[PDB]
Structures are given as structure tokens and as C-alpha cells.
Amino acid sequence: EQKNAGGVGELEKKAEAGVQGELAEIKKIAEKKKDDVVKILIETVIKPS
Amino acid sequence: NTVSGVNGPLVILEKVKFPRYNEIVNLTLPDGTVRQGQVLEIRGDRAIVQVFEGTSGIDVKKTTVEFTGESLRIPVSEDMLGRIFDGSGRPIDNGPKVFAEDYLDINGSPINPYARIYPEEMISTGVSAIDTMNSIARGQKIPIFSASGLPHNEIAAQICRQAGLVRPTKDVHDGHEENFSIVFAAMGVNLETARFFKQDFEENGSLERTSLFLNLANDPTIERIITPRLALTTAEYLAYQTERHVLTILTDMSSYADALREVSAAREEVPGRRGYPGYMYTDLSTIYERAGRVEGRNGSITQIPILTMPNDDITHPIPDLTGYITEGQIFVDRQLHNKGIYPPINVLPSLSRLMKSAIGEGMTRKDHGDVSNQLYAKYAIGKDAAAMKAVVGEEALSIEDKLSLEFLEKFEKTFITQGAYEDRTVFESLDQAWSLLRIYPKEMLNRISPKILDEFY
């Protein structure tokens, strides 16, 4: 039980560590093609959505 | 234009008739609120709308409307798994929304490509009393019908936790080769109970693979009736796109009936059979068309709907239509529950139509269906023999009744009694059947062929 109230912290270290690679490719590929989606957003907005 | 008048949660709008059916309307009220609705009716410069939010707090000529230009279609993703939702598809954990990757109709089936190859390969749930006596297939719909005051929800929990601990041993035998996911719909289900279903999903390993939809009866009727359809669109999308068997646990069927009943009284409809809607068929049927194998025939939606009997009768319209549209039923009997049997699955009327059309070979015996026929027929005979024992007394009874009396007693405490975190294999149930069934001579065992019978009694 002691490993179910103090060894469940390390299980949460391991959930933090596995997404710091994701939170960074998220920002990579969002930043590149950001500009290409805006152009589609503008022609669409000034016409019917 | 403005709200002309409002009747219960249907609102009479005066508005131009150009909008298409099911298109969202937004009423801008002077309270600051925006409330969303669906045109239930379009008429000549007027509409009848069901409001999503609310049922009241709606002004006459001070309230105004705006059109979306968009039909009611559910934004469905597969990023909605591993997260807890309300009955209208929004997190209650208040984090990022459902979002979409498609929009799918709930007003009519999208693709409708159901089964041209009969569901025929077995699904095991770890229960002898279910799986043997009623054969489950990938796309088949068998419902659990229970009575008021019973723990319908606890039996549904058993089904969830043991299904998916069977699957890797079943994977070897052939019955899965694909991801398994749960789509769980509550209408009219208690907070406590819901919290039990989440715990069930933790145990199994499919809290990450399930979507939970919670509507309470203290949330509008209009939200409540969307909740099963939202469940179905979610479940057929996983099933379609990445070829997954989704098992749908839809509790409770009468709670859904209840809401239909209130927007019938509020409609210009007359209620037919016993105060329930005269279009009660169309409602139920919308749910049941979606179930069966979907395109590519490695995706499916399998249904166990849960019904609690509102008056505790099997003459009441709800179970009677529902039973006709579905393939069989599983009965729970009150007398069992009180005695402390678990699961209290009384097999006296429990039968599933596909029994020799839900089995094959290489994972089931072909004898599997045949064995079921002995078990069901003897159970009944036994049940009759016990009825005569109660009246006449043993001395009066003949030899045939005594054997059968004995069979019945053994059946209750051994077959339908098993643990609640205890899995079973279909092979294993049949071997247990053979011993118990072995209490009669060959003259009397004649609901199975002499070849198979000679081997095993």
C-alpha cells in the first residue's frame, strides 16, 4: 500500500516525461504550416464559411 | 424573428421558413444567455424548436434568433476516448472539448452498411450463464431485462470488467484481432452508480478506450434523448474507421422512453399503447438499425441494452416491442437476487435466437448450441417438478420428477453461481454442463443426437 501512495508519484513523473517530446513537435509543425492555413481561413471568412 | 410563444420545452418561433430540417437555431435572450435548438418543425413563417439548454426562462418579443446554417450532426473524433463527458458531448472535467474529425447524423444513419454476412463468431464475457445459454456474436443485440429494485447496473458492471480479460485467450482461439472499446451511455443513472462504471473501466484497462456520456433526469429531456444517438455515432465511428468491436451498454431503456413520453404530450401527438408514444416503434428502431457488422467486416457494433421494467411486467409495451426488434433476451429474476445468487440469471425464458447461427467451430463446439437445448429444456422441466413438489409432496411425485428436481438444485448453486471477478471459457462451461445434465438415462436425454450423446451424457 506504501507503493500505492508514494510509488504512484513516480508513475506521474513518467507521464510528465513522455509528453515533453509531443508538446514540442506540436509547436514545430503548428508553427510551419500556420501561415498556410490562415490564407485558407481568410478566403473562406470573406466568403461563406 | 422573435419567440411567438413557448410550450413546455418546445418553443414556437415566428421565423422565415427558408432554413433546412435539423438546422441549429440560437435564441439570444435578454439574460445574456444563448440557447441552442433544433427545428423539430418548419411551417409557413413559423417553427417549432426543441431547446437544448433549459425548458423555461424564455421571453416573448424581447428574445431574438440567429441561424447557424448547419444541421444537427455530432462532431465525432477518436480523441474522445479516455475522457468523461455529459450527455450532449462536452467534458465535465472542463478540459479541451470533444472536437471533430467528421460530423455524423443522428437524424438517420450516415452510411447504413449493416451486415450481409451474419454475425457468427463468438464473443465471451467470462460468464457461463450468459455465454452458453445465450450465444453472443459480433454485431448481435441481446438485451438484459430486469425488474425494479434489482442491481441491473451491477450485472452490467460484471459484463464490463470480465470482458476484455477473456480476449487475449479468446484471440488465440479466434474471436478478436482488433481493438476493443466501450461506449457507455447513462440516461437516468445515479452519480454513485456512474462512479462504479468508471471504476469497472479502470479494472479492465479500457478507461483510456471508453467514452462516458452522463445525462441525469435533472438535465433537460431534450439532452436526454440525444444521449443514445450521440453514443451510437461515437461507437460506429471507431468501429468503421479503425475496425473495432465496440460494445454498447445503454442503461436504462425506460428512462429514454420517459423523455419520449414528455415530448409527445408536448407535441400534437396522441400517445398510443399505455400512455407511451404511438410512434414508440420508430424511436426504438433507430437505435437497433445501428448494430451489426460495418464495412470491411472487422469493425462492428455489438449491443447489450439494459431495460428495467417499469411495472415489472412482460406485457407492458416497452419490453414487448424491444424484445421483438432485438435478438433474444436475458432474464433476471427477483427470487434469485434475494437468495444471494450471483449472477441471478434465471434461464426459464432466457433464449437467444442465434444459437446455431452464432457458433461455428475452432472456438466453439458445434455441439455448443445442442448442449444449450438440453440445459434449457431440463431447466424448465425441473422448474415444473419443483412446482409439483411444493404442492403434492415428494411421496406423490413419480420417478421422472425426482431426477428433474435434483437437476434444478444443482443448476442453481453451481452453474449460475460463479464469482464476480471470475472468467470462464466456452469449453469449460460445456464440460460443467455435461456433469450436471448427467442425472438422466439415455431415454430421457433426447434433445441432442445419439452420436454426440453416446460420447457424453
Binding site: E1, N4, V8, L11, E12, A15, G18, V19, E22, L23, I26, K27, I29, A30, E31, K33, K34, D35, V37, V38, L41, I42, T44, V45, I46, K47, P48, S49 | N1, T2, K15, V16, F18, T64, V65, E66, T68, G69, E70, P75, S77, D79, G82, R83, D93, G95, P96, F99, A100, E101, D102, Y103, Q199, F201, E202, E203, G205, L207, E208, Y421
Partner: protein, 165 residues
């Protein structure tokens, strides 16, 4: 016997933890995806103000927003609500709006454009119109901020799939 039930129970408490952590884990992956998606919309709307503050590039857009708005009205008289820097732009193209509207419907051209004495936020709202009937009870909020917000509903599935599928 009963050690196994309680051992199983604590072993169920063990995967009880395992699931809440693995759920929060994907809730972080997903809420980052949106933090960036709403910075694509952040770009869009700096563009929308910059165009709105043009008076020559903005006219063919503005006209099309009033005209489209009129097709989702279809009423004989319309009142058109705008920002006080778009009113003079409506004023110099009225004839063109009643024409373009009449051409795109079976209906004969609109009688009157009444340039409303109501004013939309200058802070929150940039360009576009709220087009309304004679009595002002049917409104199409056909502003640029609004149109972006309505496009977000359907634009979103397309974008989540190409970047993230």
C-alpha cells in the same frame, strides 16, 4: 483465500492510479494541440482588423458580406448595422448591393438600405455588418469575428487531420 480478495483489491487500487495518470497524460497532449490551433486563429484576426482598416481593398469584401447576409434574410426592407468607419463605405456602394442581391434571387431588388444609427464595438469587433429585416427581429451577425468563429466549427476537423493524422 480472503488475502486474495484484499490483495486483488489493492492490486485494483494500483491500476486505479495507473489510469488517472495515463488520462491526464493525453489531456496534456490534446490541450497543447489547441493552444497552437488558437494561435492560428490569433493570426487570422490581426489580418482581419488590418483589412477592415483598408477602405479600398475592403469594399469588394464588405459588399459580399452584406449581399450574402441578404440571401439568408429575403425580406423587402433591410436595416444594416455597422461600425462608424464602414457606414461611409456602405453609403458609396448602395446601388451595387441592391443590384447584386436582386440578381442572386428571383426577387426584385431591395427597396431601401437604411444605414443604422446603432454601432458595434470598436474594440471587440472589426468590420462587417449585422443585417436585419424591417422590424429588426431576424439578424444575421455577419461580422468578420463571427464568421471566423462559425468557420472554426467546421474548419477544425480538416486541420486536426492533416497536421495530426
Amino acid at each position: 483465500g480472503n488475502f486474495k480478495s484484499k490483495l486483488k483489491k489493492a492490486m485494483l487500487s494500483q491500476q486505479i492510479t495507473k489510469s488517472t495518470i495515463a488520462n491526464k497524460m493525453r489531456l496534456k497532449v490534446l490541450s497543447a494541440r489547441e493552444q497552437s490551433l488558437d494561435g492560428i486563429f490569433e493570426e487570422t484576426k490581426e489580418k482581419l482588423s488590418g483589412i477592415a482598416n483598408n477602405r479600398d481593398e475592403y469594399k469588394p469584401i464588405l459588399q459580399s458580406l452584406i449581399v450574402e447576409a441578404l440571401l439568408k434574410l429575403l425580406e423587402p426592407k433591410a436595416i444594416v448595422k455597422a461600425l462608424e468607419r464602414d457606414v461611409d463605405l456602405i453609403e458609396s456602394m448602395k446601388d451595387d448591393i441592391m443590384r447584386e442581391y436582386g440578381e442572386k434571387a428571383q426577387r426584385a431588388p431591395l427597396e431601401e438600405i437604411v444605414i443604422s444609427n446603432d454601432y458595434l464595438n470598436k474594440d471587440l469587433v472589426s468590420g462587417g455588418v449585422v443585417v436585419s429585416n424591417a422590424s429588426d427581429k431576424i439578424e444575421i451577425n455577419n461580422t468578420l469575428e463571427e464568421r471566423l468563429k462559425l468557420l472554426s466549427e467546421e474548419a477544425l476537423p480538416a486541420i486536426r487531420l492533416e497536421l495530426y493524422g
